[PDB]
């Protein structure tokens, strides 16, 4: 979440079994989506306009 | 129940400073935390200083006490 | 019945393959 952990935005852990995704901005660890490399939150408020091109308020 | 396969693993913190020790009647109670190393035969004489997350505990190993992992005998938490 | 690991719906529930769960 904070800036005391951006040692993954790089991707260099130490093993093939260490990579706490860390959300771009949120930076937290708990939900770091992949398709966008950010957070579930990030997905909402951002897509909420033109910060998730190709998106839209899904309905059917 | 359990499974390793082709290439069983003994941590070379002890396995390593194990092969050497042996050469005189084995060492005298290793101190490598390593409680995650497959127990191996030649040891059968040593004594292990395996961690407990706070504590280090005694474990005079045996060949029968082999198909195990150092601390399967190292009881972590505390009960009654 | 669904936990009978060794049955059709057994491996068909847990969703796996074994002796009873074949390919075709």
């Amino acid at each position: 979440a904070r800036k005391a952990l951006i040692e993954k935005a790089k991707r260099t852990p130490k093993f093939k079994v260490r990579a706490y995704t860390r959300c771009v901005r949120c930076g937290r660890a708990r939900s770091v989506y992949r398709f966008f490399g950010l957070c579930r939150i990030c997905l909402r408020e951002l897509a909420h306009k033109g910060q998730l091109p190709g998106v839209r308020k899904a309905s059917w | 129940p359990r499974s390793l396969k082709k290439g069983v693993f003994v941590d070379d913190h002890l396995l390593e400073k194990v092969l050497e020790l042996n050469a005189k009647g084995e060492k005298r109670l290793i101190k490598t935390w390593s409680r995650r190393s497959t127990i191996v035969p030649e040891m059968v004489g040593h004594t292990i200083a395996v961690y407990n997350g706070k504590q280090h505990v005694p474990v005079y190993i045996t060949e029968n006490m082999v198909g195990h992992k150092l601390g399967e005998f190292a009881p972590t938490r505390t009960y009654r | 019945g669904k936990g009978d690991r060794r049955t059709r719906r057994g491996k068909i529930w847990r969703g796996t393959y074994g002796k009873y769960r074949p390919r075709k």
Partner: protein
């Protein structure tokens, strides 16, 4: 004879973004393969609004890569020229094959 794929983000942008890549060659390579539809595939994410509890309201989020096709039939250089690098569109991309 000239496969032209082009997935996209808008329904008639893409649709039109190539709809200019059609009838010219219907009088050059011989004809075309028509403005080919192609079933669109999607992605979704529906997530928990605001942290802590709540959950139940996630809100849905689509995203479409509308795969479209139009394929010009038969080249002819007249074809290769009749809608050559005679481009125009932006919102979409294209895959060229044969």
């Amino acid at each position: 004879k000239i496969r032209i794929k082009l997935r996209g983000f808008d329904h008639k942008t893409l649709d039109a973004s190539a709809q200019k890549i059609v009838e010219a060659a219907r009088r050059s390579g011989a004809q075309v393969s028509g403005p080919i539809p192609l079933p669109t595939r999607v992605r979704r994410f529906t997530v928990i609004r605001g942290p802590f509890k709540h959950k139940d309201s996630r809100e849905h989020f689509e995203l479409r890569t509308h795969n479209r096709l139009v394929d010009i039939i038969n080249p002819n250089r007249k074809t290769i020229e009749q809608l050559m690098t005679l481009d125009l569109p932006t919102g979409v991309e294209i895959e060229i094959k044969t």
